[PDB]
Design a protein around this nucleic acid. Sequence first.
DNA 1: ATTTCACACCTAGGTGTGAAATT
DNA 2: AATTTCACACCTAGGTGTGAAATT
Lengths: 175, 180
Amino acid sequence: GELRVGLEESELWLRFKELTNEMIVTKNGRRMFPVLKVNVSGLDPNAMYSFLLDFVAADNHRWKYVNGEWVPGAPSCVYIHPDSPNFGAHWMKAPVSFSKVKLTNKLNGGGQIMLNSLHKYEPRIHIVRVGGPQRMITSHCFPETQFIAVTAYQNEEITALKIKYNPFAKAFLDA
Amino acid sequence: GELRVGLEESELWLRFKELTNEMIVTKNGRRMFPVLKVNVSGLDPNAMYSFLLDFVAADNHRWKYVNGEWVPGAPSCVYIHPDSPNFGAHWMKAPVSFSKVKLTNKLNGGGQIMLNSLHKYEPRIHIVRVGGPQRMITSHCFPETQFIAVTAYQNEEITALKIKYNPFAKAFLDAKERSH
DNA sequence: ATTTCACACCTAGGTGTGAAATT
DNA sequence: AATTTCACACCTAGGTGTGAAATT
Ligand code: NA
């Protein structure tokens, strides 16, 4: 196939993956960091597509953080990228960033993807053809972006990188 | 026809309009206030459309504000609404607000609309069918939203209404409510 | 007469913190 | 004790008119 989906900023994602990544989930929705950003080529530049994001279990068991390490102890709803629907040229000319998806531990509203806390999840992206002869769906999972949903950060080394890179955490970037 | 396009918050618009509305233009682009919003019905909920905004000259005069009144003394580039392209159901389920369009006097390529200062303009919206059997471009002009592009507000009565309704001007609101 | 621009002051909201609540 | 919640200080990000200054 012509389609090519690449995870942008993989170096940054692997820095979090190494220490086991954590994404805060809140009742009101919490943005991800790092932000999932995808590079796409191979779409028809003049065809219409919608990008979808959901979250798949990365394993089967509940997780627990004890003594500085992670120990064992259903697919989410889908989020539509706010640029959808759009032509393939739009999706290809710049990386598709899911900067506005919010993760939550309660089904309290729309636009927020509910996650079960202390479980490992893998982001999965779907490219949906809009108005073609037939339905085209492609799935793309990125192992580098696996994480455990938490209500509070467990590994402080993750907290440090979150502070180091998320501009919204700049006030804590003193140390 | 089936299509129906009407202006949201027309009452607010006509408050500026009967004073002679004014829109600041800057080098880096200035958002409009009030924001142009339209209610759409009659579109095919499953067909694809884009919404386009441009500005047509409301007359041939240059304009001048002297002693508390206005006096005599080419269509713009088009702004594509950020929700474009989208299904008719998306356009119809809520007003189409052009809250992010920026008006400038120095066209420097940032997606902003260059206008001529001290000229009178009328927002004009275009609904364009996206990838149908054939073209469909409608146009809708809203006489209520006519305005004069300015580098600085001339009519303080207009400035007061900006301060009263634009929440980004809230810092000046209390002193304005104590006037007259 | 007209345009420019740094500025204070806002809207709007995204961070981790840490005390507290919940279990 | 493990986990969740929440008000908070502190930021990013950027939209206002003001009025002193600059430009014509
Ligand atoms: Na400009």
